[PDB]
RNA sequence: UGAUAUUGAAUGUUGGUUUGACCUUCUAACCCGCCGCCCUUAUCGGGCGGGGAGACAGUGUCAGGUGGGCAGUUUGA
RNA sequence: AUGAGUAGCGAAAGAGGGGUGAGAAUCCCCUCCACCGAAUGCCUAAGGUUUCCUGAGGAAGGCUCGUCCGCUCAGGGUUAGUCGGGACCUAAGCCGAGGCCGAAAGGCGUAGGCGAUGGACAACAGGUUGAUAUUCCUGUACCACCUCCUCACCAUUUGAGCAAUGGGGGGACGCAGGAGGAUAGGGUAAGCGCGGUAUUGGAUAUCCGCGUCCAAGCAGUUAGGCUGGGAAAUAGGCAAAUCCGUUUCCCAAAGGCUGAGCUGUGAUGGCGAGCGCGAAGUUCCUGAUUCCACACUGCCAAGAAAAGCCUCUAGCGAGGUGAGAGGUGCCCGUACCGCAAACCGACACAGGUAGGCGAGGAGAGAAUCCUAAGGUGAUCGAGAGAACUCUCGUUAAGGAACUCGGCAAAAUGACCCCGUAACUUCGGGAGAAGGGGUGCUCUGUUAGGGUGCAAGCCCGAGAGAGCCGCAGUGAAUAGGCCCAGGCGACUGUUUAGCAAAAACACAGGUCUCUGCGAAGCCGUAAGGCGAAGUAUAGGGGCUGACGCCUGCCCGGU
RNA sequence: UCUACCCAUGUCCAGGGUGAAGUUCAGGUAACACUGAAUGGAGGCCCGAACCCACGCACGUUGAAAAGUGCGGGGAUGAGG
């Protein structure tokens, strides 16, 4: 297992902008992972400490394309709160 | 008026559900019938 | 003894109860309680097998020493108590070893009275003995058919059984049914008419009270339909309409002796 | 309800040819929703020990009776 | 296609001005008006499953239109050690190793385990965005666990300390009634603060409007509630015992368990009328359906289990105990609707949908009328005001002649006083019937009561005088009554969707069966209900309170 | 998942009235019995909202509705919902 496999990608919204102003970043993650895994993942990757983590998981939006009405994939997004006396990220 | 169908997913899944159908012989036979036809939703 | 309520209302009209004067307390021993759950006449199979049952006040079982296996241990009565599970009352007694038990409640018994259950014991009330050591001309209850099994007999309220004689290994006994029987002699029994003595002398007064006792209504067969009962049917209120009164299951009721003919206890019994 | 197999050991009894039948008795069969111990922290069962009943009962096969409890059917033109 | 541009367009107040836009009764904003207000309001389940928010669009759906949305497109949005649920407990029931039965299939069932609707369990009060929030932010806390560490104490084999999957305690319980205590809440009654003193005649104060708070936790305290204690000995508590239990002695109030709430802190903050800033922020009265609390009393129909917790030893026991500091604390759900246009009813359906909160005046009251907080103006309209239909309101004189029938409608209706029959099971009948009075002002803040230290607030019988009206429970709501009879004693139950009854049931009576492996019943049987009962019980049949009675036939079945 | 019955656990029933048993007091009795007040608080008790049920009518009867609505109605601390 690897942290690189844990994390999936970030979330770029005005919300995420507002939050990275306040030092707490966000991500989206494989659905099975947990809070401690992602915490250590960040610490191991970016070399940065953590104050806390707050985690979520959304369902799959139904959609429509012609007759076809499948469902979007699920998502497990995770907000992490860096400490002060901690680095930022690109 | 009150009507027949008062939904409770628990009751649905505990009567018409997969564990239940697999519990009994006759419930297995359903799944057999309910496959070789080709039903996508073979049970609750 | 009993109370006779005044007729403030047509339901309360005619009602009688017990005074519960013999009672001493209002709370049992947790150590001896045990749970129950009603059954509604249903069985393991879920099917209903007996009618007229279900839906009463809940209860909590009072464990009983119907055996009196303890011997050579003088006990002392402590209390008399109500048991919803039976017509009679019970008596909490305490032995010198610190053990506590419930027993049935004879009449004329009081708190502080002492008890012994072993064969050498005395034949006064409350004590228990084998029929051998018991003499002729005694009033007895919680009689047991087999040693060690406990009483499967006169236990109910106001009841009593008389002793008549012996044949060595067996013993003649009269029973509250009026019936004579041979009983194995080593089998124990307890002395004295059972206490309450007036349970039969009650006007329940209304229907709700029987419902509280857990009795469901009883539908007569002459109003059912013929699919349901033989007596059922008939335009207008009608008589039986056949050779005998009959059960829902097609058997007669009046006089038709139901006991098995090839039964074995016929040897031990005498009359009825 | 009876015959028979499980279902044997005796003491007598009466029959015709030893024999079977009948009454009593016993126990080891069988049975126990009786007790104690172990399996086992178990109200199942199952092994031991006792105890109780006992060649009965129960069960299987056969037979008779009863049997609208139940079923299939008829009840003319 | 016809029917036919016909019926219908699904309860309920809208009007106007502005704006948008190609285009407006129908969309947005404003102002008025109107409806709900024990509900059409706030929370929240089940269920739905993106309907939520924002911005575009108006082909379809919307019973019309549509610039609009619970429609279409894009995007975004749901943050938990403490909430609810799992890593905790068990009921009913279910599964069920082995096992017991059984043509097979399978059924039953022990040990064991699942299983909430219950038990136990650590966090609240303020802000916060367009959408989340006792989850985020700010403050202050708490629970469990861990030691790289600091401190204090104790002890290493009588060796301090730990706590059994065992024992014991406790958890652990009904129904009703009623006093008490406290609190939410309410009143604005004072007092305080802010603002205004107006144009219709009048009013500087004797006036108007608005607001007049703050937890969890920590320390202390308490209304009160329960509970008798201490010392020895032990036929029991499957092995043991300092714990239980039992007995005997010495004391008789103390002790303990609790305890709603209250005081200080928390609070050198927050909130707050009102204008990113910010005043006063107390007292009095009333007062629960809520808490103390099933606490007390009474009653009988006699009122879950288990685990958490405490304790006992057994056992483990060479390092432990306690406090502090530092640190760790997972998974699921969290949007939104939730008497509704998202749920169940095929519909944006006059229906149904568990539970918590639930204001004010009058008021006994959650009734009822009008209003708050707050929410709605309801998915076709305007315009004439006819027959006819429906729902309503009035009616001359008469007054049930209508009629199968006083069906329907009308009438009565609240409170107080007087008075109240035949009959009776002596309880009732009975709110019988029948009569009479209710408004406002002054005596009067009354006689008096509650509170209060008092002042001061609440309640307010009665009479006297007087004033008005057709009319004084002036509106809404809240019995029509009587005489007699049949049937059934009664309260109850029933043909969901034609029939509510004289039918069923009922308590009571009677007959019969059944000696406990009962009997009966289910099942092929095992296994079960009966019953963890035992003839004063259980089953079956008939009859039906109560009172007086229940006659003759046993030939037939 | 409707509905009948049952099991287990929970929960709801505004307000008002009647006034039992018992207890005490007084009269009364040899004692009682009995009588009058106070307390007390029962009841398949009363009136009546929520809630539940459906008798009477009307309307609807190609409905707002595949069993309803409106006006009244019955029960409403017990066989309760």
Curated annotation (Swiss-Prot), chain A:
One of its GO terms (biological process) is translation. GO terms for molecular function: rRNA binding; structural constituent of ribosome. It comes from the Bacteria. Keywords: Ribonucleoprotein, Ribosomal protein, RNA-binding, rRNA-binding. One of its GO terms (cellular component) is cytosolic large ribosomal subunit. One of the early assembly proteins it binds 23S rRNA. One of the proteins that surrounds the polypeptide exit tunnel on the outside of the ribosome. Forms the main docking site for trigger factor binding to the ribosome. Part of the 50S ribosomal subunit. Contacts protein L29, and trigger factor when it is bound to the ribosome. This is Large ribosomal subunit protein uL23. The gene is rplW.
From Swiss-Prot, chain B:
InterPro entries: Ribosomal_bL34 (IPR000271), Ribosomal_bL34_CS (IPR020939). Residues 1-19 have a biased composition (Basic residues). One of its GO terms (biological process) is translation. It comes from the Bacteria. It holds the Pfam family Ribosomal_L34. The keyword Ribosomal protein applies. Keywords: Ribonucleoprotein, Ribosomal protein. The keyword Glycosyltransferase does not apply. Residues 1-27 are annotated as: Disordered. GO terms for molecular function: structural constituent of ribosome. Belongs to the bacterial ribosomal protein bL34 family. PANTHER family: LARGE RIBOSOMAL SUBUNIT PROTEIN BL34M, MITOCHONDRIAL RIBOSOMAL PROTEIN 34 FAMILY MEMBER. Part of the 50S ribosomal subunit. This is Large ribosomal subunit protein bL34.
From Swiss-Prot, chain C:
Belongs to the universal ribosomal protein uL2 family. GO terms for molecular function: RNA binding; rRNA binding; structural constituent of ribosome; transferase activity. SUPFAM superfamilies: Nucleic acid-binding proteins, Translation proteins SH3-like domain. It comes from the Bacteria. Residues 218-272 are annotated as: Disordered. Part of the 50S ribosomal subunit. Forms a bridge to the 30S subunit in the 70S ribosome. One of the primary rRNA binding proteins. Required for association of the 30S and 50S subunits to form the 70S ribosome, for tRNA binding and peptide bond formation. It has been suggested to have peptidyltransferase activity; this is somewhat controversial. Makes several contacts with the 16S rRNA in the 70S ribosome. GO terms for cellular component: large ribosomal subunit. Keywords: Ribonucleoprotein, Ribosomal protein, RNA-binding, rRNA-binding. Disulfide bonds: none annotated. The keyword Ribosomal protein applies. Gene3D superfamilies: 2.30.30.30, Nucleic acid-binding proteins, Ribosomal protein L2, domain 3. This is Large ribosomal subunit protein uL2. Residues 257-272 have a biased composition (Basic residues). GO terms for biological process: cytoplasmic translation.
């Amino acid at each position: 297992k690897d942290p690189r496999d844990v994390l999936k990608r970030p979330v770029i919204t005005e919300r995420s902008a507002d939050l990275m102003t306040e030092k707490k970043y966000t991500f989206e993650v494989d659905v099975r992972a947990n809070k401690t895994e992602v915490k250590d993942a960040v610490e191991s990757i970016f070399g940065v400490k953590v104050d806390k983590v707050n985690i979520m998981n959304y369902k799959g939006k139904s959609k429509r394309v012609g007759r076809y009405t499948g469902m979007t994939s699920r998502r497990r997004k995770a907000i992490v709160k860096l400490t002060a006396d901690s680095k930022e990220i690109e | 008026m009150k009507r027949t169908f008062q939904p409770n997913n628990r009751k649905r899944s505990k009567v018409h559900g997969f564990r239940s159908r697999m519990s009994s012989k006759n419930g297995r036979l359903v799944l057999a019938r309910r496959r070789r036809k080709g039903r996508k939703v073979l049970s609750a | 003894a009993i109370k006779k309520y005044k007729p403030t209302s047509n339901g309360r009209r005619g009602m009688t109860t017990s005074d519960f004067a013999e009672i001493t307390t209002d709370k049992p021993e947790k150590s001896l309680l045990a749970p129950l759950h009603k059954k509604g006449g249903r069985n393991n199979q879920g099917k209903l097998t007996v009618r007229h049952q279900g839906g009463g006040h809940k209860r909590q079982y009072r464990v009983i020493d119907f055996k009196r296996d303890k011997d050579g241990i003088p006990g002392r009565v402590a209390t008399v108590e109500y048991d919803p599970n039976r017509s009679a009352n019970i008596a909490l007694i305490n032995y010198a070893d610190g053990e506590k038990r419930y027993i049935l409640a004879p009449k004329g018994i009081q708190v502080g009275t002492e008890i012994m259950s072993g064969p050498e014991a005395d034949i006064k009330v409350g004590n228990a003995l084998p029929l051998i050591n018991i003499p002729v001309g005694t009033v007895v209850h919680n009689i047991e058919l087999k040693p060690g099994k406990g009483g499967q007999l006169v236990r109910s309220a106001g009841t009593s059984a008389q002793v008549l004689g012996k044949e060595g290994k067996y013993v003649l006994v009269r029973l509250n049914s009026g019936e004579v029987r041979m009983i194995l002699s080593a089998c124990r029994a307890s002395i004295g008419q059972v206490g309450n003595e007036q349970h039969e002398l009650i006007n329940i007064g209304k229907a709700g009270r029987s419902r509280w006792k857990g009795i469901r209504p009883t539908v007569r067969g002459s109003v059912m339909n013929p699919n349901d009962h033989p007596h059922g049917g008939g335009e207008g209120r009608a008589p039986i309409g056949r050779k005998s009164p009959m059960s829902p299951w097609g058997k007669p009721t009046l006089g038709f002796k139901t006991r098995k003919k090839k039964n074995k206890s016929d040897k031990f019994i005498v009359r009825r």
